[PDB]
Short mmCIF file of C-alpha atoms in Angstrom, two decimals:
data_model
loop_
_atom_site.label_atom_id
_atom_site.label_comp_id
_atom_site.label_asym_id
_atom_site.label_seq_id
_atom_site.Cartn_x
_atom_site.Cartn_y
_atom_site.Cartn_z
CA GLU A 1 119.04 -36.23 98.09
CA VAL A 2 119.29 -34.81 101.86
CA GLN A 3 117.56 -37.58 104.28
CA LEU A 4 117.44 -37.34 108.15
CA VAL A 5 115.74 -40.39 109.57
CA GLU A 6 115.07 -40.77 113.19
CA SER A 7 114.85 -43.92 115.14
CA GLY A 8 113.28 -44.14 119.02
CA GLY A 9 109.81 -43.34 119.69
CA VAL A 10 108.57 -45.68 122.09
CA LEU A 11 106.69 -45.01 125.53
CA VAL A 12 108.67 -44.18 128.47
CA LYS A 13 107.36 -44.47 132.04
CA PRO A 14 107.63 -41.32 133.62
CA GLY A 15 111.29 -40.30 134.96
CA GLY A 16 113.18 -42.78 132.71
CA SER A 17 115.63 -43.10 129.45
CA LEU A 18 115.90 -43.25 126.55
CA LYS A 19 118.02 -42.89 123.12
CA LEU A 20 116.78 -41.34 119.83
CA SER A 21 118.95 -41.82 117.06
CA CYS A 22 119.08 -40.20 113.67
CA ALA A 23 120.66 -41.46 110.22
CA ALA A 24 121.60 -38.88 107.94
CA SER A 25 123.08 -38.90 104.26
CA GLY A 26 123.37 -37.19 100.79
CA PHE A 27 125.38 -34.16 102.12
CA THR A 28 129.12 -33.68 104.00
CA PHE A 29 127.37 -34.47 107.53
CA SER A 30 130.40 -33.48 109.70
CA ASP A 31 129.75 -29.88 107.81
CA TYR A 32 126.91 -29.14 109.78
CA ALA A 33 125.74 -28.40 113.49
CA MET A 34 122.65 -31.20 113.90
CA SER A 35 119.61 -30.02 116.28
CA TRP A 36 116.53 -31.82 117.63
CA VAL A 37 113.68 -29.73 117.57
CA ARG A 38 110.38 -31.14 118.98
CA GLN A 39 106.80 -30.40 118.33
CA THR A 40 105.26 -30.08 122.05
CA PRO A 41 102.03 -31.16 123.17
CA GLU A 42 100.17 -27.89 122.01
CA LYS A 43 101.55 -28.26 118.22
CA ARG A 44 104.06 -25.71 118.95
CA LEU A 45 107.86 -26.02 117.36
CA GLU A 46 110.43 -25.96 120.55
CA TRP A 47 114.20 -26.21 119.77
CA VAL A 48 115.45 -28.65 122.08
CA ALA A 49 119.40 -29.41 121.17
CA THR A 50 122.36 -28.72 118.94
CA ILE A 51 125.98 -30.10 118.48
CA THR A 52 128.11 -28.36 116.54
CA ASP A 53 129.88 -29.74 113.51
CA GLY A 54 132.73 -31.50 114.89
CA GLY A 55 131.02 -32.89 117.87
CA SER A 56 133.15 -30.77 120.03
CA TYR A 57 129.97 -27.93 121.51
CA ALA A 58 126.91 -28.60 122.51
CA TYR A 59 124.11 -26.51 123.54
CA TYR A 60 120.52 -27.18 125.51
CA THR A 61 117.19 -25.12 125.61
CA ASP A 62 116.93 -24.29 129.80
CA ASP A 63 113.98 -27.16 130.35
CA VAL A 64 116.39 -29.96 129.28
CA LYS A 65 119.86 -28.76 130.94
CA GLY A 66 120.68 -31.44 132.84
CA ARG A 67 118.60 -34.15 131.47
CA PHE A 68 119.20 -34.71 127.91
CA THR A 69 122.56 -35.10 125.95
CA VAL A 70 122.90 -34.50 122.07
CA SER A 71 125.98 -36.44 120.39
CA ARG A 72 126.88 -37.31 117.13
CA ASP A 73 129.36 -40.09 115.56
CA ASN A 74 131.09 -38.27 112.90
CA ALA A 75 132.12 -41.76 111.28
CA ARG A 76 128.70 -42.99 110.71
CA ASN A 77 126.48 -39.77 110.11
CA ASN A 78 124.69 -40.37 113.35
CA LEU A 79 123.00 -38.08 115.73
CA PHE A 80 122.08 -39.20 119.24
CA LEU A 81 119.65 -37.64 121.93
CA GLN A 82 120.11 -39.18 125.41
CA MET A 83 117.43 -38.42 127.48
CA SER A 84 117.08 -39.09 131.14
CA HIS A 85 114.69 -38.06 133.68
CA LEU A 86 112.10 -38.03 131.39
CA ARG A 87 108.66 -36.04 132.31
CA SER A 88 105.40 -35.72 131.32
CA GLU A 89 106.08 -32.36 129.04
CA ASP A 90 108.62 -34.26 126.98
CA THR A 91 105.71 -36.05 125.58
CA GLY A 92 106.33 -34.90 121.40
CA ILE A 93 107.68 -35.53 118.37
CA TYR A 94 111.44 -35.19 117.78
CA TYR A 95 112.61 -34.05 114.55
CA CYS A 96 116.38 -33.99 113.74
CA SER A 97 117.75 -31.20 111.85
CA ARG A 98 120.27 -29.84 109.89
CA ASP A 99 121.32 -26.67 111.85
CA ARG A 100 122.44 -23.85 109.93
CA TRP A 101 123.59 -23.08 113.71
CA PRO A 102 123.33 -19.35 115.15
CA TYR A 103 120.38 -19.06 113.09
CA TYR A 104 117.96 -21.45 111.15
CA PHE A 105 117.00 -25.12 110.40
CA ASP A 106 117.01 -26.02 106.51
CA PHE A 107 116.46 -29.66 106.43
CA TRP A 108 114.00 -31.84 108.75
CA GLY A 109 113.35 -35.50 109.46
CA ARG A 110 110.21 -37.26 109.41
CA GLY A 111 110.04 -37.36 113.33
CA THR A 112 109.97 -39.85 115.98
CA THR A 113 107.20 -39.74 118.79
CA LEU A 114 108.21 -40.01 122.71
CA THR A 115 104.88 -40.52 124.45
CA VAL A 116 105.64 -40.47 128.64
CA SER A 117 103.34 -42.13 130.62
CA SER A 118 102.80 -44.97 133.00
CA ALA A 119 99.99 -46.77 130.72
CA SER A 120 101.46 -50.42 128.88
CA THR A 121 102.53 -50.42 125.08
CA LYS A 122 99.73 -52.40 123.28
CA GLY A 123 99.68 -53.71 119.48
CA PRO A 124 96.60 -53.30 116.91
CA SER A 125 94.34 -55.99 115.90
CA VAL A 126 93.93 -55.15 112.23
CA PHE A 127 90.81 -55.92 110.19
CA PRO A 128 90.08 -56.24 106.70
CA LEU A 129 87.64 -53.08 105.24
CA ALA A 130 86.61 -55.64 101.76
CA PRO A 131 85.33 -53.85 99.12
CA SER A 132 81.57 -55.18 98.27
CA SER A 133 78.60 -53.37 96.63
CA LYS A 134 78.25 -51.16 99.35
CA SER A 135 81.49 -49.29 98.72
CA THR A 136 81.22 -49.14 95.44
CA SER A 137 80.58 -46.29 92.71
CA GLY A 138 81.15 -45.08 89.39
CA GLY A 139 83.31 -48.11 88.64
CA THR A 140 85.26 -47.29 91.69
CA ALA A 141 85.77 -49.23 94.81
CA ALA A 142 86.86 -48.21 98.00
CA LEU A 143 89.08 -50.72 100.99
CA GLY A 144 90.94 -50.50 103.68
CA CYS A 145 92.14 -51.93 106.74
CA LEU A 146 90.92 -50.88 110.42
CA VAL A 147 93.62 -50.50 112.93
CA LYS A 148 92.17 -50.95 116.47
CA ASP A 149 93.00 -50.98 119.74
CA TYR A 150 96.97 -49.99 120.11
CA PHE A 151 98.52 -47.34 122.70
CA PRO A 152 100.15 -45.19 122.16
CA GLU A 153 100.35 -43.39 118.89
CA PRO A 154 102.01 -43.55 116.17
CA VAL A 155 101.15 -46.34 113.65
CA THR A 156 102.38 -45.61 110.01
CA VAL A 157 100.24 -47.37 107.47
CA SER A 158 101.23 -48.28 103.77
CA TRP A 159 99.63 -50.24 100.87
CA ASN A 160 101.31 -52.88 98.83
CA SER A 161 104.78 -51.94 100.72
CA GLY A 162 104.90 -48.61 99.44
CA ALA A 163 104.01 -49.30 95.77
CA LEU A 164 100.47 -48.04 96.25
CA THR A 165 100.50 -43.94 97.14
CA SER A 166 97.63 -43.11 95.46
CA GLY A 167 93.56 -42.57 96.93
CA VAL A 168 94.83 -43.46 100.14
CA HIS A 169 93.65 -41.65 102.87
CA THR A 170 94.68 -42.65 106.72
CA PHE A 171 92.10 -40.80 108.92
CA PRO A 172 93.85 -39.45 112.36
CA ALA A 173 93.03 -41.96 114.99
CA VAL A 174 90.54 -41.61 117.48
CA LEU A 175 90.92 -42.13 121.32
CA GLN A 176 88.56 -44.87 122.57
CA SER A 177 87.03 -44.58 126.12
CA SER A 178 89.22 -47.96 126.67
CA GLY A 179 92.57 -45.40 126.65
CA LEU A 180 93.39 -47.16 123.37
CA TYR A 181 93.52 -45.48 119.86
CA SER A 182 91.83 -46.88 117.11
CA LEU A 183 91.99 -45.48 113.30
CA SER A 184 91.48 -46.55 109.48
CA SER A 185 93.09 -46.93 106.04
CA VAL A 186 91.58 -46.58 103.25
CA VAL A 187 91.96 -46.81 99.23
CA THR A 188 89.95 -46.09 96.10
CA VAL A 189 91.15 -48.05 93.48
CA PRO A 190 89.46 -49.98 89.66
CA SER A 191 86.00 -51.97 90.44
CA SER A 192 87.68 -53.89 87.31
CA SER A 193 90.59 -55.04 88.34
CA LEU A 194 89.85 -56.27 92.08
CA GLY A 195 90.38 -59.80 90.63
CA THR A 196 93.69 -59.23 89.28
CA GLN A 197 95.51 -56.72 91.87
CA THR A 198 96.21 -57.90 95.29
CA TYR A 199 96.24 -54.95 98.24
CA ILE A 200 97.77 -55.62 100.96
CA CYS A 201 97.75 -53.05 103.72
CA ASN A 202 101.32 -52.86 106.00
CA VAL A 203 100.92 -51.95 109.74
CA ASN A 204 103.66 -50.92 111.30
CA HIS A 205 103.31 -49.87 115.97
CA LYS A 206 107.18 -48.90 116.22
CA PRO A 207 106.36 -48.53 119.78
CA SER A 208 105.08 -51.91 120.39
CA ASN A 209 107.42 -53.86 117.61
CA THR A 210 104.39 -54.96 115.97
CA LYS A 211 104.25 -55.10 111.99
CA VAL A 212 100.63 -56.85 110.91
CA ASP A 213 99.99 -57.27 106.76
CA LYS A 214 96.83 -58.00 106.03
CA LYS A 215 95.61 -58.82 102.46
CA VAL A 216 92.34 -56.99 101.53
CA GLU A 217 89.85 -58.91 99.22
CA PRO A 218 86.34 -59.09 98.21
CA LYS A 219 84.36 -61.36 100.45
CA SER A 220 81.78 -63.84 98.85
CA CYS A 221 78.73 -63.38 100.63
CA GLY A 222 76.48 -66.89 100.02
CA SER A 223 76.68 -70.06 102.54
CA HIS A 224 75.29 -73.41 102.23
CA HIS A 225 74.50 -73.08 106.37
CA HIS A 226 72.51 -69.90 106.65
CA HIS A 227 69.37 -68.53 108.35
CA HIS A 228 67.42 -65.18 107.38
CA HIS A 229 67.75 -63.02 111.25
CA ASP B 1 110.22 -11.49 126.45
CA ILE B 2 110.99 -12.41 122.99
CA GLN B 3 107.37 -13.44 121.49
CA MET B 4 105.81 -13.02 118.03
CA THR B 5 102.22 -12.67 116.88
CA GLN B 6 101.39 -14.21 113.99
CA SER B 7 98.41 -13.06 111.71
CA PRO B 8 96.21 -14.29 110.65
CA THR B 9 95.96 -17.11 112.46
CA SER B 10 93.79 -18.97 110.13
CA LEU B 11 93.04 -18.28 106.63
CA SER B 12 90.64 -19.97 103.78
CA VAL B 13 91.76 -18.41 100.22
CA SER B 14 91.34 -19.82 96.46
CA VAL B 15 93.88 -21.28 94.14
CA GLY B 16 95.54 -18.46 92.19
CA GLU B 17 95.03 -15.94 94.75
CA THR B 18 97.10 -13.97 96.77
CA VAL B 19 97.93 -14.60 100.12
CA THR B 20 100.00 -12.45 103.20
CA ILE B 21 100.51 -13.82 106.13
CA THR B 22 102.45 -11.48 108.85
CA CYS B 23 104.20 -11.61 111.91
CA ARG B 24 104.94 -9.14 114.64
CA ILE B 25 107.81 -9.28 116.96
CA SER B 26 108.33 -7.86 120.68
CA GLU B 27 111.70 -6.31 119.62
CA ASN B 28 113.63 -5.43 116.58
CA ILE B 29 115.31 -8.43 115.54
CA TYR B 30 116.86 -6.64 112.29
CA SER B 31 115.99 -9.37 109.96
CA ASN B 32 116.78 -12.04 111.67
CA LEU B 33 113.72 -14.17 110.64
CA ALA B 34 112.91 -17.54 108.62
CA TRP B 35 109.54 -18.99 107.47
CA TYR B 36 108.43 -22.54 107.46
CA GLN B 37 105.30 -24.35 106.18
CA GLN B 38 104.31 -27.75 107.82
CA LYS B 39 101.70 -30.21 106.45
CA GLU B 40 100.02 -32.85 109.18
CA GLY B 41 102.03 -35.52 110.28
CA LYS B 42 105.09 -34.51 107.70
CA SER B 43 107.83 -32.44 108.78
CA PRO B 44 108.45 -28.93 108.26
CA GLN B 45 110.06 -27.04 105.35
CA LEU B 46 112.20 -24.08 105.10
CA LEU B 47 110.94 -21.11 103.29
CA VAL B 48 112.52 -18.01 103.95
CA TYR B 49 115.22 -16.99 105.77
CA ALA B 50 117.37 -13.82 106.85
CA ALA B 51 113.67 -12.59 106.49
CA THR B 52 113.80 -12.06 102.51
CA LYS B 53 116.06 -15.08 101.41
CA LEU B 54 114.31 -18.00 99.54
CA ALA B 55 115.05 -21.39 100.28
CA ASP B 56 116.36 -23.62 97.74
CA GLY B 57 113.90 -26.09 95.85
CA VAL B 58 111.07 -23.44 97.10
CA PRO B 59 108.77 -22.36 94.43
CA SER B 60 109.11 -18.48 93.46
CA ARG B 61 105.76 -17.86 94.38
CA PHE B 62 106.98 -17.73 97.78
CA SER B 63 108.49 -14.68 99.34
CA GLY B 64 109.03 -12.42 102.30
CA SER B 65 109.32 -8.73 103.30
CA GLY B 66 109.87 -6.61 106.34
CA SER B 67 112.47 -5.22 108.82
CA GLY B 68 112.42 -4.36 112.51
CA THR B 69 109.33 -5.64 114.30
CA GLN B 70 106.86 -6.44 111.05
CA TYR B 71 107.63 -9.28 108.91
CA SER B 72 105.36 -11.08 105.99
CA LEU B 73 105.26 -14.05 104.01
CA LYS B 74 103.45 -13.68 100.56
CA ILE B 75 102.27 -16.38 97.97
CA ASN B 76 101.94 -14.60 94.80
CA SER B 77 99.02 -17.29 93.40
CA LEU B 78 98.01 -19.43 96.11
CA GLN B 79 98.32 -23.59 94.83
CA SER B 80 96.34 -26.56 96.13
CA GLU B 81 99.38 -27.85 97.38
CA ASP B 82 99.94 -24.31 99.84
CA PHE B 83 97.92 -25.60 102.54
CA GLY B 84 98.86 -26.36 105.57
CA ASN B 85 100.64 -24.28 108.89
CA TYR B 86 103.05 -21.51 108.20
CA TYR B 87 105.35 -20.57 111.45
CA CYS B 88 108.10 -18.05 111.68
CA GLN B 89 111.48 -18.21 113.50
CA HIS B 90 113.70 -15.26 115.39
CA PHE B 91 117.58 -15.83 115.80
CA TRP B 92 118.02 -12.94 117.32
CA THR B 93 118.98 -13.87 120.73
CA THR B 94 119.09 -17.66 122.35
CA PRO B 95 117.02 -19.59 122.51
CA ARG B 96 115.50 -19.39 118.94
CA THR B 97 111.80 -19.61 119.12
CA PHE B 98 108.88 -20.34 116.82
CA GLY B 99 105.60 -18.46 116.40
CA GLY B 100 102.16 -19.93 116.61
CA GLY B 101 101.14 -20.89 113.22
CA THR B 102 98.74 -19.65 110.38
CA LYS B 103 96.35 -22.40 109.35
CA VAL B 104 96.17 -22.13 105.54
CA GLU B 105 92.94 -23.79 103.88
CA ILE B 106 92.56 -23.92 100.10
CA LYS B 107 88.85 -22.55 99.73
CA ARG B 108 87.00 -24.38 96.37
CA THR B 109 83.74 -25.28 94.82
CA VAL B 110 81.36 -27.55 96.88
CA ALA B 111 81.66 -31.30 96.42
CA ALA B 112 79.47 -34.04 97.59
CA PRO B 113 80.57 -36.62 99.68
CA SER B 114 80.86 -40.49 97.84
CA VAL B 115 79.44 -42.51 100.92
CA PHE B 116 80.52 -46.33 101.41
CA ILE B 117 79.69 -48.52 104.45
CA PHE B 118 81.54 -51.65 105.50
CA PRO B 119 80.20 -54.61 107.96
CA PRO B 120 82.27 -56.01 110.60
CA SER B 121 84.95 -58.39 109.58
CA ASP B 122 84.09 -62.16 110.03
CA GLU B 123 88.04 -62.28 112.18
CA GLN B 124 86.46 -59.55 114.30
CA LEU B 125 83.06 -60.79 115.22
CA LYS B 126 84.92 -63.80 116.47
CA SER B 127 86.87 -61.77 118.64
CA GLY B 128 83.21 -60.38 120.56
CA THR B 129 82.96 -57.02 119.02
CA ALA B 130 81.48 -55.66 115.69
CA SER B 131 82.97 -52.48 114.20
CA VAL B 132 80.70 -50.86 111.51
CA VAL B 133 82.43 -48.43 109.00
CA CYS B 134 81.13 -45.41 107.36
CA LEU B 135 83.47 -43.36 104.30
CA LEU B 136 82.70 -39.95 103.69
CA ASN B 137 85.35 -39.41 100.71
CA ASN B 138 86.32 -36.39 99.36
CA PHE B 139 84.23 -33.53 100.18
CA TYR B 140 84.51 -29.88 100.25
CA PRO B 141 83.69 -28.04 102.69
CA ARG B 142 84.76 -29.87 105.91
CA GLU B 143 81.38 -29.62 107.94
CA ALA B 144 79.39 -33.12 107.15
CA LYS B 145 77.23 -35.03 109.85
CA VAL B 146 76.85 -38.88 110.43
CA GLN B 147 73.90 -40.49 111.56
CA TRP B 148 74.29 -44.05 112.31
CA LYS B 149 70.29 -45.86 112.47
CA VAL B 150 70.19 -49.23 113.56
CA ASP B 151 66.60 -50.76 112.31
CA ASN B 152 65.70 -47.38 111.75
CA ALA B 153 66.35 -46.07 115.54
CA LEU B 154 68.86 -43.13 115.66
CA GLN B 155 72.17 -43.91 117.90
CA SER B 156 74.08 -42.21 120.08
CA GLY B 157 77.39 -42.96 122.06
CA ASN B 158 78.42 -45.52 120.35
CA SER B 159 80.55 -44.24 117.40
CA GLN B 160 83.57 -42.12 117.10
CA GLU B 161 85.03 -40.14 113.96
CA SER B 162 87.51 -38.08 112.66
CA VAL B 163 88.56 -35.88 109.15
CA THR B 164 91.71 -35.87 107.55
CA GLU B 165 93.84 -32.88 106.91
CA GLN B 166 93.00 -31.18 103.27
CA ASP B 167 94.03 -33.23 100.27
CA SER B 168 96.92 -31.30 98.59
CA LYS B 169 95.41 -32.03 94.98
CA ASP B 170 91.76 -31.48 94.84
CA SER B 171 91.58 -29.46 98.45
CA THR B 172 88.90 -32.26 99.76
CA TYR B 173 88.25 -33.28 103.03
CA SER B 174 87.52 -37.06 104.07
CA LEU B 175 85.92 -38.22 107.06
CA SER B 176 85.55 -41.98 108.51
CA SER B 177 82.74 -42.79 111.73
CA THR B 178 82.82 -45.85 113.41
CA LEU B 179 80.00 -47.71 115.32
CA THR B 180 81.09 -49.76 117.87
CA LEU B 181 78.69 -52.94 119.25
CA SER B 182 79.19 -56.31 121.36
CA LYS B 183 78.71 -58.92 119.45
CA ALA B 184 75.73 -60.05 121.01
CA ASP B 185 74.00 -56.20 120.39
CA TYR B 186 75.16 -56.60 116.72
CA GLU B 187 73.18 -60.19 116.20
CA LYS B 188 70.07 -58.39 117.59
CA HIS B 189 69.52 -56.07 114.79
CA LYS B 190 68.98 -56.52 110.65
CA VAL B 191 69.65 -53.21 109.28
CA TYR B 192 72.85 -50.61 109.69
CA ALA B 193 73.03 -47.60 107.99
CA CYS B 194 74.74 -44.47 107.72
CA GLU B 195 73.20 -41.11 106.92
CA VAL B 196 75.21 -38.25 105.80
CA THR B 197 74.28 -34.78 105.25
CA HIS B 198 76.17 -31.91 103.75
CA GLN B 199 75.99 -28.62 101.76
CA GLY B 200 76.73 -30.47 98.75
CA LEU B 201 73.89 -33.00 99.18
CA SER B 202 70.15 -31.60 98.61
CA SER B 203 68.95 -34.47 100.43
CA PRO B 204 70.33 -36.84 102.85
CA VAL B 205 72.22 -40.05 101.77
CA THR B 206 71.65 -43.52 103.49
CA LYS B 207 74.31 -46.33 102.76
CA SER B 208 73.08 -49.42 104.79
CA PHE B 209 72.97 -53.22 104.59
CA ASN B 210 71.01 -56.35 106.20
CA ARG B 211 73.27 -58.43 108.54
CA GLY B 212 73.47 -61.86 106.22
#
């Protein structure tokens, strides 16, 4: 199957540089023009640059002329976007695409997020949302991870290294008044098998290069040292 | 310059129904048009190109028509997986540009949320902060009110919430709300409660725990 997988996607100081990469597979790479299309702040799709199939010719949208260079390695099925003089308006999600040049874009990659900002990157802390009698009903239990205090977006969350996708809700993040992001990822599973299944949320904040894995299990409530207030 | 109007900007329509989305252009572009679906987070998908040509792997309930300055995308019987944003794109002159979008919502019957509360992890409390999470799962329509109550006192200013996009299988929404307190403020109250209102609920639903 066709596959376009971007890399890069970090914080950059205003005025700085960055190389985005795209690995292509599942078709004859050198047969196709290749493009970057970005999803701007507003949520509008905007073509950026296109390199013809041979890497000979390159085309750019006015706003990035003289600042960005698109190139390709036909020996390895790689597409690059070299960016210098980054400015705040360049912040967005950058999709590698297969370009039926002049015309339309018939395959797109997952996207990579470029945040232009003078803030520091910060990785998240990850906390369990343990299933308990407060998250159970109808034989079904909800559990999750709370992913707190990271910048910039995004964090990606998976469960059990990708082997669990059903019943998962990963919520849009909220911007805390610290300027740091927060989000939760939950899943609802059978109560029955909370003693046999192990559930691990996998948190990847690529902009900070931090991965965190966190087992989420039922927590036994009682304690020999305890009081009532 | 070359610009487009997409219309409607927003639609809400039931499964099995017929939806037309229209793209009107400022010049005649001689059928040099394409259509795309994008769901939140996820990457765009080509639907239709050259105004009338169905892209491969696209269900045949999609089709496109029109010419000159008037183009249309028609979904024959809408399916729950056809939620998201739809965009037109011209390729008449340079640059190729994109329309503003039509957001498509799947209308369905009412579903009450299931409500779940989570006390702070013991690991977080050791760091000095107490996040309390209230979860509203799989409801419709989107509108849902969360009220935080601490020792029966109406809270305000210490929570934030957010809604998912629409579910591609059941067309419901889910919502997560977090109440944030210092550890010290957390230890001075007993009852932490989440009070939920929705069109699908006659009386409100309260999930609560005692710190213990």
